Amino acid sequence: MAAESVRVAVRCRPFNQREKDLNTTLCVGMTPNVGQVNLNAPDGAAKDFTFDGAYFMDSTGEQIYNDIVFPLVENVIEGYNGTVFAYGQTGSGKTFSMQGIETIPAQRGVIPRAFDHIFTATATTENVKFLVHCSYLEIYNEEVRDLLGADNKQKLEIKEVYVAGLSMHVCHDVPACKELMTRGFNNRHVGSSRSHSIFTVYVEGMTETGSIRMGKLNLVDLAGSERQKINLSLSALGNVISALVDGKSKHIPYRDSKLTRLLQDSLGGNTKTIMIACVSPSSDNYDETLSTLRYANRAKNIKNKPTINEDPL
């Protein structure tokens, strides 16, 4: 019912083989106890930032999920809208935090964890019956496409907010969700750096009193945040966040891109939103990391108004 700011967590990825070979300097510092993130310049001069979560090179998707995503997914199951999106330059770790890996068990991402969590929590609740639906879309060069639809290479129209004609796939267990994510990656545009993608899980709960709640979860993997209408949605996103927090902007320019129009309810609206800002640890990425930290620091101040979406008969 009440005003709720956007939760922001920073996740610094570990060095990569090449950063180790080059003998790259660790310019990023963290003190997770108070969500502190520092960025050291080549001379030593540090820049300090405070976030709701700081995850250093040794962090797992298992610990980020438990701390930040798990209470949001419980909120979704109660009839709330929830949005989790990854922000950061190409290479920073956005996809590793969203999808993750299944050969290091603690490094499974927030997406397959939300599937296991939703299906386990809905199976334990005997006082509410549940219908799970799943959609998956991609926005490349302002062209919205349905990664699950019958014609995966067709542009879609938006009406008000919804993507008019997007397929909503019913899921009866976790493997049904995993089949859509697998088939959705094969429908990505080739003719994954400059495109964005939204995977939504809708949780409809019918209670014994009779009322029905409808909460949805948006799992957003954004395009690379690196400097340079291919970048229209990314520039509009920053402009939207800027308008939302600058205090002078009475009119938020959501209609300036396909991504901002869709995620409009997740930025200032009836949604509990979480941003996962992914950063690289190496000094060769100083400018992009500084850009991402400043951008995520501004996102902290977006004021949403999430309420329970539960209509009684």
Swiss-Prot record:
Disruption of the gene: reported phenotype: Worms are defective in osmotic avoidance, chemotaxis and dauer formation.
Function: Kinesin motor protein which is required for the anterograde intraflagellar transport (IFT) along the middle segment of the sensory neuron cilia together with the kinesin II motor complex (composed of klp-11, klp-20 and kap-1) and on its own, is required for IFT along the distal segment. In addition, regulates the length of cilia. May have a role during neurogenesis and axonal transport.
Tissue occurrence: Expressed in an exclusive set of 26 chemosensory neurons whose dendritic endings are exposed to the external environment; six IL2 neurons of the inner labial sensilla, 8 pairs of amphid neurons in the head, and 2 pairs of phasmid neurons in the tail.
Name of this protein: Osmotic avoidance abnormal protein 3
Span of domain Kinesin motor: 5-302
Domain of life from the UniProt record: Eukaryota
Keyword ATP-binding: yes
Residues that bind ATP: 88-95
Localization, UniProt: Cytoplasm, Cytoskeleton; Cell projection, Cilium; Cytoplasm, Cytoskeleton, Cilium axoneme; Cytoplasm, Cytoskeleton, Cilium basal body
Gene Ontology molecular function terms on file: ATP binding; ATP hydrolysis activity; microtubule binding; microtubule motor activity; plus-end-directed microtubule motor activity
GO BP term, example: positive regulation of dauer larval development
Gene this chain is encoded by: osm-3
Taxonomic lineage from the root: Eukaryota, Metazoa, Ecdysozoa, Nematoda, Chromadorea
Keywords: ATP-binding, Cell projection, Coiled coil, Cytoplasm, Cytoskeleton, Microtubule, Motor protein, Nucleotide-binding
